[PDB]
Design a protein around this ligand. Structure first.
Ligand SMILES: Cc1nn(C)c(C)c1-c1cccc(-c2ccnc3nc[nH]c23)c1F
Length: 123
């Protein structure tokens, strides 16, 4: 069975909308979102649909761009580093569960390259 998704709403969190966090939503996430290989990462891994009954038995901190987008829209992050950490968790989860050369890994690799290019310079 699928776990509940990561939390995206928490009114008790200390909240900020920095220039970098606005940029991470308006520019970085929304550009990655339109990439041709973004679709597998636009929502939590559906282990039931994808017949990956061991996915959430190996991956303990799931992450996806749908969750990141919801977090950014809720000002869930205090700084850009917290949000960048979620992107890196998303890519790293993919590389952990899969193997070099798998289609999903090539797709994550492409998105990661673009992600690193877009975050090289923040406001
Ligand atoms: C690419 C691809 N090719 N095929 C044969 C399948 C079933 C896929 C695929 C479709 C949808 C999501 C995912 C996926 C997303 C994030 N992480 C994953 N880890 C393993 N699958 C993951 C996916 F790989």
């Amino acid at each position: 069975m699928n776990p509940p998704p990561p939390e995206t709403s928490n009114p008790n969190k200390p909240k900020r909308q920095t220039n970098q966090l606005q940029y991470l939503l308006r520019v970085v996430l929304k550009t990655l979102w339109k990439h041709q290989f973004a679709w597998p990462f636009q929502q939590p891994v559906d282990a039931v649909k994808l017949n990956l009954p061991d996915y959430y038995k190996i991956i303990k901190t799931p992450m996806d761009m749908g969750t990141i987008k919801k977090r950014l829209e809720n000002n869930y992050y205090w700084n850009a580093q917290e949000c960048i950490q979620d992107f890196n968790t998303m890519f790293t989860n993919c590389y952990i569960y899969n193997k070099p050369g798998d289609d999903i890994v090539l797709m994550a690799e492409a998105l990661e390259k673009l992600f690193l290019q877009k975050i090289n310079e923040l406001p």
